[PDB]
């Protein structure tokens, strides 16, 4: 018998995925995201659209999905399909098509303390206006804007990821496995939190 069945049927019983997991009234959910570029597919200059394949890593804490390992023989990590849980509604806002969401709804890794690690892959078609003055000797500055589609700053706090104490203020690119585009060379890949 996979103890994981007992455990998951204990967790998802009496669980409403429509309800934000705010512990108290003025509790903001710290949602930490990080981006990983897999391929730069194209940059259509006639439609001013950037196509990319990204793996976005999203972390947050759900106080309802915590347990004590001694009662479950030491299991400290479990995999639950994303469509059964409460998710922050992190979307790409500057899309040209109507694709706000991710492509593959992967499982979520849930730890005994309520930590949630979700790494869904996505195919996005962003909008970036082209500067044509120097075409074909030009360089372009194209942005990917991520927001919550449902919650405000009194509900969730979007932040960038911090590995080993130092923030990750850049797009992550695997130096060994990354295949260069064919027409475009990536010079800079910064990231920042903005406010309107």
Ligand X SMILES: *[C@@H]1O[C@H](CO)[C@@H](O)[C@H](O)[C@H]1NC(C)=O
Torsion angle of the four alpha carbons 185, 188, 193, 196, in this order, in degrees rounded to the nearest 10: -70
Asked if residue 68 binds ligand X (CB under 6 A), the reply is yes
Asked if residue 128 binds other proteins (CB under 8 A), the reply is no
Q: Answer for the pair 120, 104: CB distance below 8 angstroms, yes or no.
A: yes
Residues 64 and 40: their CA atoms lie apart, in Å, by 38
How many CA within 13 A on the CB side of residue 44? 10
Q: Which does 1 bind (CB under 5 to 8 A by kind): ligand X, other proteins, none?
A: other proteins
Give 2 or 70: the residue with its C-beta nearer to ligand X: 70
Residues 178 and 71: their CA atoms lie apart, in Å, by 44
Among 30, 71, 76, 83, binds ligand X (CB under 6 A): 71
For residues 22-51, which are near other proteins according to CB under 8 A? 22-23, 25, 36, 39, 41-42, 48, 51
Give 70 or 133: the residue with its C-beta nearer to ligand X: 70
| Shortest reach from residue 140's CB to ligand X, in Å | 54
| Shortest reach from residue 73's CB to ligand X, in Å | 9
Beta-bridge partner residues of 118: 58, 108
| Candidates 136-144, 170-178, 186-194; binding stretch for other proteins (CB under 8 A) | 170-178
- The dihedral built from the CA positions of residue 80, 55, 17 and 32, taken in this order, carries a sign that is positive
DSSP letter (8 states) at residue 190:
B
Residues 169 and 167: their CA atoms lie apart, in Å, by 6
Q: Which does 71 bind (CB under 5 to 8 A by kind): ligand X, other proteins, none?
A: ligand X
Asked if residue 166 binds other proteins (CB under 8 A), the reply is no
Torsion angle of the four alpha carbons 166, 180, 57, 75, in this order, in degrees rounded to the nearest 10: -100
Interface ranges with other proteins (CB under 8 A): 1-5, 8-9, 16, 18-20, 22-23, 25, 36, 39, 41-42, 48, 51, 53, 55, 57, 73, 75, 79-81, 84, 89, 96-98, 100, 103-104, 106-107, 109, 119, 121, 123, 127, 129, 149-151, 172-177, 179, 181-182
């Amino acid at each position: 018998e996979n103890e994981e069945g007992r455990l998951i049927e204990k967790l998802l019983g009496d669980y409403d995925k429509r309800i934000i997991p705010a512990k108290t009234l003025d509790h903001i959910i710290d949602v930490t995201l990080k981006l990983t570029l897999t391929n730069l597919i194209s940059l259509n200059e006639k439609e001013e659209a950037l196509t990319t394949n990204v793996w976005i890593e999203i972390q947050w804490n759900d106080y309802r999905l915590s347990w004590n390992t001694s009662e479950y023989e030491g299991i400290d990590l479990v995999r639950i399909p994303s469509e059964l849980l409460w998710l922050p509604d992190v979307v790409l806002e500057n899309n040209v098509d109507g694709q706000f969401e991710v492509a593959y709804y992967a499982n979520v890794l849930v730890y005994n303390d309520g930590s949630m690690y979700w790494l869904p892959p996505a195919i996005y078609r962003s909008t970036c206006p082209i500067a044509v003055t120097y075409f074909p000797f030009d360089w372009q500055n194209c942005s990917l804007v991520f927001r919550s589609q449902t919650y405000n700053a009194h509900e969730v706090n979007l932040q960038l990821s911090a590995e080993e104490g130092e923030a990750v203020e850049w797009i992550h690119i695997d130096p060994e496995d990354f295949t260069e585009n064919g027409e475009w060379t990536i010079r800079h890949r910064p990231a920042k939190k903005n406010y309107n």
